[PDB]
Every structure is written in C-alpha cells, then in structure tokens.
Design a protein around this ligand. Structure first.
Ligand SMILES: *Cc1c(COP(=O)(O)O)cnc(C)c1O
Ligand SMILES: *Cc1c(COP(=O)(O)O)cnc(C)c1O
Lengths: 294, 294
C-alpha cells in the first residue's frame, strides 16, 4: 500500500517509484483568498504525479485487482476515457508493467490524448456517430465504449470503469479522508467537493463523519462535463466557478481547473452564509492543474 | 526562508501558502528505466507549484530583493519572458502581493501566456520586428525587452532578469544541492543537468563538491531554445532527448519536458560509459511537466 502502509520519506529520503508520489498531498491554507473569520483549506491534488486527484482511484483500482488475483502480472488493461482517469491509469500501469489501451472519440481535441500517449497508452480513436470534431456526443462516447468492450472480449483484458468499480470510493475513505483529519489535527467543521463518480465526496465524507459526526459534508453541484447534479448541497454557476478559479490564481498563486473554481466558490458561499460555527474550518479539494485543459 | 528555515510539515500538517510548496521536492529512483548496475535518481521539480524548477529561483530573486529593502511592499515587478520563469515569478508575486507585468512577443503561441495570466500577470504582447506568428526572432525578443525596460523606467518597478541576477544560482546552492545530499544520505557519485541560466548546475554542483569533492558534475549540452552549448560535459541529440522523454513516461509514469529527456539520455550514457565507479549513484533533474508545452 504505497498510499497508507508507507515508510517512504518523500522529504528527506528516496521515493521508490511514481506510485509513492500519489496521495499524502499538501493541505494548503487559502488565507489570502479567505482572510477570515473561519478558515479555508484545500487538498493540493494537482501535485499528484499526473496532476489530478484521479491518481488515487487509479492506484486503488489496479492495486486492489492485483491483490485479489483478478489482474495477473503483465495482463493488459483497457479503459474508455478522454480525461484525468486515463492519465492516472496510464501512470500506474506504466510503473506496474501492464500494457494499457485507451479508446476515445475522434471528436476529442488531440490534446486529450497527449499525456496518456506519453505514459505508454495505446490510444485508439473511434469514429464519431453523430458528433463532429470538438463536439463529442453521447452516441460518439457509446461507440468508443463498444470498441473498448469488444477489444476487452477479444484480448481477455482487465476493464477499468471508475463509475462502476467499488474500489473507486475506497481510495478516498482510506487516504484522502485520513490525511485531512491528520493535517487539520482533527479541526474540521465542513468538507465539500463536487461529484463526477462521487468517489471523492463519498469516501472522504464517510471517514470524516466517523471521526467527527458533527462535521457537515456538502456536494458542490453545477446550477443546471466532469461534475454533475444530484445529501446537503451547494449550487455554483459556471460564472462563479470561473470567477474563483481566477481569484485562486491571483491571490494564492495556484492554477487549477474549472471544477476547482466551483469548489472554492461553494466553500466561500458556505463561509459567508453564517450557517457554520464561529471560526469554522472548511476543507475542499484543488482537483487538478489548469495545464490539463486545451 | 520558506525553502530552508522551515518548520512546515507538508505531509502531516498545514502548508501556510504556495511559497511553502516550492522546493523539498521528491528524489525519485528511476529503477525501471535503469535497472543497474549503479542507480539513477532524479529531483521531481515538476512538483513545484507552477510545475517547473523555476519556482526556486523565482522565490529567491523576489525574497532576497525584499530582504535587502530593494523591493518594497506592494511595489510593481516586471519581466520579459514567454517561459517557465514567468510562471514562477507570477506565483510568488501573487502570494506576496506584488503587481506583476510581463512582456513577450506577439509571435508566441497564446498558450505561452495562459498560466502567467491565470496567476495575475498583466501580459503585454509586443509587435514582432522580423518574425511572424510561431517564429519569434532575436529581434522580436529584443523589442519585448525594450518595452519592459521602458515600462520599468516609467513605473520605477523592480526588473527580474534570471540571466543577470546573482541570487539566481544562490537558490540551488541553498536548496537543491542540500536536499539531494540529504535524500541520498550522502551517496552520490555524479550530478548532471543542462544549462539555461546555469543556475541549477552551478549552485547545485558548488554545494555537492563541498560535501564530496570526489563527486563528478557534468553539464548536459545539446549537440549543436531552453538549454545551451558552452566544465565536464555530455552531448545529447534532439533525437536522444525525445527518445528518453518517451522512455521516462513509458517505464516510470512521469510526463516531463524535452530538457528532462536530454538529462535522462545524458545520465544513461554516463552510466553505460564505465567511467564511474562500480555501483555509482547518478542524480539528475526532472525540470518540468510535459503539460507546459503547446
Ligand atoms: C474526477 C474529477 C472530479 C470528480 O471526482 P470524483 O471522485 O469522480 O467525484 C472533479 N474534478 C476533476 C478535475 C476530476 O478529474
Ligand atoms: C530554466 C530551465 C532549465 C535550465 O535551468 P537553469 O537553472 O536556468 O540552467 C531547464 N529546463 C527547463 C524546463 C527550464 O525551465
């Protein structure tokens, strides 16, 4: 367990592989963006080795499948993905010696394949059904998924599906949550994050509510891509997400993605609301680097 | 001194600002790319908050100018740059509350300004003299530099020039070198890196040769952009740099820039040469993320 049972000293010793770079990310105080009262802190998930939080779930999905004997040594892995999850799976399979094949729609920007290809993935571009270059439809995605399912059947590969695999949320129950609890020294009044798979929210919140049943956990929802609509939740507009993505860069020096701006907008709404206790500590997630975007 | 005199616990405590993310980067063992005999290790400078080693020199140039009283509280800063140094200076000035202006040629890809703009820089695009979009000439760069010099004169700003400022190399003498020595537990037989300003090579090597005068330090030279030709040196072709950039991704899961591939190609040539002792430990630098490239 590179993320939990580790004697690796990243600061003062040798890091054995990129797997040991995943997790144990910094918890940064955003004290210039939010000068009080109460405190805003956020996990620096853009400092994972592929620059998103997906490294955590990618490591868990593969490591757990190896541990159970389902994924054999040097067995092929396949995924349909144009996003962060594919970068994470490419990284972990590169280190662990698994051949990796990715399918995605030809409608994607070629930018979406660069990191996966650089990490050894065999990227297969699948013809569009209904969409056109830069407009990838539901039907275009379904055609990519069908190609991946057919290749998996023909090659007897291990299929990765972060929406359907139970170990996806386990990653954050075992790592993200326990790290926030330790880094805050047990001072946290609220946790919030947006939901794609829901793994980060569900796993992290489950752990935090075991340590402090009083902690308030909120799903960050778009008002109406990555994060999706539907317990307790905070809505943020695209305009607000863009606004706080900018403010995070200008006041804290951190260039993160769109979902990060939504998370920061929501956290600031919560801090301004007066719904929490005096001097409340609020934690959210800096999900990925702004560099990961076309 | 966020990089040297620090009581910050990044793993198990709170990181006060992005300045505390700079330096103390992981030293990774590249044991799959190089299975022996001897060992290849490299500093993970792509895990600085702007995803390059330039965060180190950027922090030093500004912090030292504040310490001497040359750069006053809230005083404007200006640089001519289309590269990593501008991202680093944008990050540090954002946190420290300095207005930052950057000039660059209009010939640059608009991609070169995105991170600086996201971190609050006032980016001024300067008309080309001799070049055209995607071909920035020496004369185009000279026109950008003239604009920056004129703005500096008119605004009484603090000018940043990493090629001419003495604190540029000091950063690596005080941080990079001492970290490699600690992380290897004093086992290092060779250090090598390419030279832009030469700050990383000069400062790091100076420190390492004080701890182990037997250590062999090599400049990585292109055969004939960022890294430049001319003590002891190793030449690498563009083809070799591309080849090892790919192998680093495929065998270690790390997606780094072109200069990183040159550094790894050179280190592997040295390890294969038989010029070092049996079981030699060789250290180089993973200078930046592959995401920083158009
Ligand atoms: C995956 C992802 C999310 C959502 O996290 P889940 O754990 O899938 O809910 C948010 N932002 C980014 C950038 C992502 O890649
Ligand atoms: C600055 C830089 C270098 C060179 O380092 P110096 O300390 O200026 O010699 C190499 N690679 C990248 C990507 C750089 O940004």
């Amino acid at each position: 367990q590179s993320m939990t049972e580790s004697t690796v000293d990243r600061i003062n010793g040798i890091t054995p592989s990129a797997l040991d770079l995943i997790g144990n990310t910094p918890l940064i105080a955003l004290d210039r963006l939010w000068p009080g009262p109460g405190r805003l802190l956020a996990k620096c998930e853009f400092l994972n080795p592929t620059a998103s939080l997906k490294d955590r779930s990618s490591y868990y999905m593969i490591a757990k499948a190896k541990e159970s004997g389902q994924l054999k040594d040097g067995e092929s892995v396949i995924e349909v993905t144009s996003g962060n999850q594919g970068g994470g799976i490419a990284c972990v399979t590169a280190v662990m010696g698994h051949p990796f094949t990715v399918t995605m729609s030809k409608g994607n920007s070629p930018q979406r394949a660069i990191m996966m290809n650089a990490l050894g993935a065999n990227v297969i571009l699948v013809d569009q059904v209904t969409g056109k270059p830069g407009n990838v439809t539901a039907d275009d995605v379904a055609a990519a998924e069908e190609t991946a399912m057919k290749i998996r059947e023909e090659t007897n590969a291990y299929y990765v599906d972060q929406f359907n695999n139970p170990t996806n949320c386990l990653a954050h129950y075992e790592t993200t949550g326990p790290e926030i609890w330790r880094q805050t020294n047990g001072r946290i009044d609220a946790f919030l994050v947006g939901c794609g798979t829901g793994g980060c929210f569900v796993g992290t919140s489950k752990f935090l509510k075991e340590k402090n049943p009083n902690v308030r956990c909120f799903v960050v929802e778009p008002e109406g891509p990555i994060a999706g609509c539907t317990n307790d939740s905070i809505s943020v507009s695209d305009e607000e997400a863009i606004e706080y993505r900018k403010l995070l860069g200008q006041k804290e020096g951190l260039f993160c993605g769109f979902t990060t701006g939504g998370n920061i907008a929501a956290a600031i709404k919560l801090l301004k609301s007066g719904q929490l206790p005096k001097d409340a500590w609020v934690v959210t997630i800096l999900c990925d680097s702004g560099l990961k975007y076309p």
